[PDB]
RNA sequence: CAGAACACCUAAUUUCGAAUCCAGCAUGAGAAGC
RNA sequence: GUUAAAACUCUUCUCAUGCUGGAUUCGAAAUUAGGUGC
């Protein structure tokens, strides 16, 4: 057998905001910032990659028109019989592609900055609301891999198509405000499952 | 069981590890300083590693002497939870940031800023008179008049009721309540800290000297500490009218003084009513950046410079004191001046040309007779009083007087009854059956928590006994339900609002009063409340009446008990 | 539990070479005193 | 720990100015009292009082008696005031009247299996603090604990589930099942016994659910053979062998048909069928 | 004498003997035999005394048919039937509150906490299936514990 | 026989780590607060199963190499008793020589387990359909285990180390596909005497 | 050797569970089964009484207890179950102490 | 009796936090001494 | 004062082995560092 390594590299091109999900990390940062960035306990920034890739592939493949279910409606059960269900999982089989998180190569101090945002009154043209958030600066580099357990033929091109959708549309939050525009560099390799067996 | 980890002079480690049967309780994880010496930190780490994994770190107040080793106890991952009062929590936010700032200026590090925020993630907060049930121990706080947020810790274990006093405040304290609040119940062990000074309100003398000097043509520089003491001397300038102006040239000292005025509900009752009226009036003029600091130092029209570097060692009191040392002016030493500090050399002439007067009224800790009075207020005589910190000398003379009162002393260098808080059943036991291989009996009665004994007594006992026998607003329960439903439908009261108000109510009543006052505070520079704006076509008079309705509705819900508040708020927010 | 048992039961109603070999197997305990007793009990029962 | 009756003291198990050392015991004169020392206590049995007695040198516990001023004079002039005094050997109202005065000198009194509260509210009615509560007293073999109706609810629901899942509708009580000859039953159950679909546990469970009537056996074989809508998994043990996927299904169908056809055979007949496979029952 | 206070429906037939699995309370009152209802009412009556001193109807066959249909579209899963057994067993006000909780359309999201139907149905009819599920599971609370268990162990055995 | 292998395994956490709570009562107690509780002890410590992950790792890699290893992951599949993983982790006849413990954490929940929020973005309107809160283990959390092989041959070291490297690749437990469970291992191996404790 | 009698009952230390069998290729739960376990931190007592004692019964019994700590006690010992810690209070006794 | 370093105004708020599958198999029921 | 009375059905042997709470689901949805002064 074989398994496919997809070493994925993200360079941030416009300030990246993904949100902190840990409750203890978030209600203890609320005295400082109203929008914390998702961080590790090693203080490196974490981005959820899988759902972005799977959302990308549902949107593009549904536009091309094949039988691909949606895993985005309210309690949407996967079918099991599609390319997205084979790659990323269903209620029967698991996902053949294990998509690791996007951890930054630098810690928070180099790449996270604490910015001030505002809501301007449209009539008086004055500052109406003010809130502080955290953003990942541009040029920060995030590394992931994607491992495909049972590799089929179309799978690299499919993942790279989703990685072109994420380059154009974005990853993370505040996506329509310009936050989260990224560039991907991908190095791929096919490896045998018996590699650690000396 | 209690261990005094370095409880002699709090240099290089100090902690009180209550070893109860379920928890490794820690009290006052703190450090003092010797103002200059490197291997110190290694003896600190050795003590810290020796502490072991402490289940709860409890901070009586917020000084580094009480809270200085806390983020180091998070770096070694020995602490589980960090409980204190909220004013203590924000004070150690500023104090841990300043501690690390000095380590960086000292060219250092004992802990890091990640250890500070990791301390403030696990940091639970409760205010006075809030008994919380943790690991066989019921823990309550009681005010001890020291500084803002300072309490004494009351731990009722089944092996005894302990009262870690912390620092007891003096009678010269104006910002806080003078009578130090206490357990209503028993105290089997009282862990008392002795004095440092001697037994006399000079007070007015400050306003005397600062009068004569300012009319003489000279500004008055008052070195002070940044925790309480600057606010004490600013409050004595706020009370009596001093015609020349005052100026705080202290950034940390100013933001602590702000931190006094959002937390005015934790101060003296006579000042809790301070209405959109500031407590320090608007008499204080705060220096913000270094350029107003430089311009004010260069400016020579007489005015109080009332700032906080401490003891003339580093800060903006320095930049003032250089030209003042070159000057009609005076230095007013309203704090103790420690060994190896430059201001001690200024206070011992080794020569500041401008006049040297120290003042002994502005003291943070109490007196010997006040520690006696602290002892005699107690409902019962304690079994044993463990004097722990102080100078060795006055620990001996206080020890002699408290032996004269015929209660027992354990000094730390010179350091065995069992007190089972017994539970006993006073009901018939013979009439029992079996259902699921359990010898059970339904019984209805009354648990009576009597000091030193929890008893379970029948209806007959209650018959015998009964036969023998803030300023919150008020509104009816149905009015509360109607107003919360109406403000919820128009989206002023939200589920995040009700959740946060529930968190501050489980925190304690005064924290919730502070929360609702902070939300309803209209900012005068803008005109904005932190209330959620309503949905509809309400004009500005109606939006103001609805904001006041929300203010007077989340107040007068605070006055109810916990169960009533939860039963009201669980309908509007099903999650807490 | 009684009735369950009693309904269950109710349904549950419906020549020198041998001397040398036995002398060998008595010492290595393959055939034993319980085995001799039950084998002789089967022989006394019949064939 | 003193147990009142005289005065028993359990440390040595003694029961109430030179020093006899048994538990340092020393008799001071009453004008007689005994001062006993142990690692957990410094108890004092005073006896009665007469005016200038001989109080010991710290009397942790002071067990005295009176029936009034002299009791309190003796309550003072004793260095390191006791933790708890005990008021014995007198009338109850006079003991309470003295006891109010020992409370006024801030000294605690007590007038004459471990039990655990698993409770959780409070009331400040009358002189004593309380919380009204109706509950249950369990008497476990080393504890006696107190519970409320939520715990009785949980064990009542456990008893209801354990007693509902214990008696079926028509078991051991008194049609349209498949039919197949005895020889094919032999060949099928031999074949399904070598490979492990019909194993000795399954033959035994068929034997109990056949002894409990035909309908119990039909219910058991259906719920063994019932393929799940979701997983598509039947409760048979998988056959050991190559069998790819469809003769898996035909083989489980063979097990279904063979057991269901064996159901209408006589009880002694299915017994002579099964003991060749499972010798026990 | 002795009085049983229980209706003797749900009586199985063990061999030639009719039989009921049951839990109760011997009361030396008329030596009454009282159910759990008795205990809950008398517990709450003593709670009120202590503290003082200081549904639509549906037919049974329609309940089986509707619970059958809602089981096939997986609105009523066995997780739902198991938790409904827990909340009915705890009491009836708890079952009312639980069923109102899962049926409450949240005003901010518009979402019911049921499981969505399997298959193509119009949004009006999917909502009507939800309202049907509210009606049957609420109507189930009007029955006793025995018929509720016997109804829902055909769909979740272990409930 | 006379010797026995002790493999002290120290695991550090890199990505968030989830392993679901298996005890019914502990899980239902936590489902009033969090929808995915971390598998935790009663001494407040994080418990992760470790034998099955090692067996699954060695099964997949030995099957890919070409060795005659049975698949015990299939539903009610009987281990034959002649595979290498049957000698290590166990068969039906004989138990496993390797007795793997759970990965007991070196800290205690309140320092390593955090309550997190995950969603379900609706793919066309980019809003949140579902929102669920699950507990996870922080990164840099340290877990300890010991693998005690009773009768060591020479391969039982390297096979365990190879399986550990596979657990660095795929993750130890829980949501391995979303990126959870990525861990690293350090190995301290020693061959002790069986008669060590006899004085 | 007495049985290891716990001091708690079932609702305090016995918890039900959910143990699984995962398919190696599909990474899905092929099998599910429930199994009770006794919790961590649960403590048990047993009294071992040795008549006619030699010198080395103490050392052998403690050595056996460290071996039980290393291996585990009970079942599922390969999955990590049953790893415990022992504390021993030894006492010499004259046999006639009931008289 | 301990930390201490050109200008303002702001730095809040609101939703959700659920839903589902599975919980099965298999082996062993004997010895021996007195 | 019973064909009495006397004699423990005792010893040896761990419900152990095999099976990972796994799978599905992006903290994102809204908000211009704006207002002041050559
Ligand atoms: Zn699909
Ligand atoms: Zn202090
Ligand atoms: Zn095998």
Characteristic key phrases:
part of a larger assembly; 7 chains; A: 198 residues; alpha+beta; 8 strands; 31% strand; B: 576 residues; alpha/beta; 7-stranded mixed β-sheet; 19 helices; 23 strands; binds zinc ion; RNA-binding
Describe the structure.
This is part of a larger assembly, with 3 copies of chain A and 4 copies of chain B. By secondary structure, chain A is an alpha+beta fold. Chain A has helices at 23-26, 50-64, 83-88, 108-111, 155-169; strands at 2-12, 44-47, 97-99, 102-107, 112-120, 127-136, 141-148, 182-192. In chain A, strands 1, 2, 3, 4, 7 and 8 form a 6-stranded antiparallel beta sheet that branches. Chain A has a two-stranded antiparallel ribbon with strand order 5-6. In chain A, a hairpin with a 6-residue loop joins β5 (112-120) and β6. Chain A is globular and about 65 Å long. Chain B has 576 residues and is α/β, with parallel strands linked by helices. In chain B, α9 packs parallel to α10 (316-326). Chain B is globular. Classes of the chains: A alpha+beta (198), B alpha/beta (576). Chains in contact: A-B, A-E, A-F, A-G, B-D, B-E, B-F, C-D, D-E, D-F, F-G. The A-F interface holds A 1, 21-25, 40-42, 46, 48-51, 55, 58-59, 70-76, 88-89, 94-95, 97-101, 103, 144, 147, 175, 192-198 and F 14-16, 60-65, 114-118, 120-124, 126, 129-130, 133, 136, 138-141, 158-159, 161-163, 165-166, 169-171, 176-180, 182. β22 of chain B pairs antiparallel with β11 (130-138) of chain D, so a sheet runs across the interface. One zinc ion binds at residues 69, 78-80, 82, 84-85, 90 of chain A. The structure holds a RNA duplex (34 and 38 nucleotides).
Summarize this structure briefly.
This is part of a larger assembly, with three copies of chain A and four copies of chain B. With 198 residues, chain A is an alpha+beta fold. Chain A has five helices and eight strands; from the N terminus they run E-H-E-H-H-E-E-H-E-E-E-H-E.
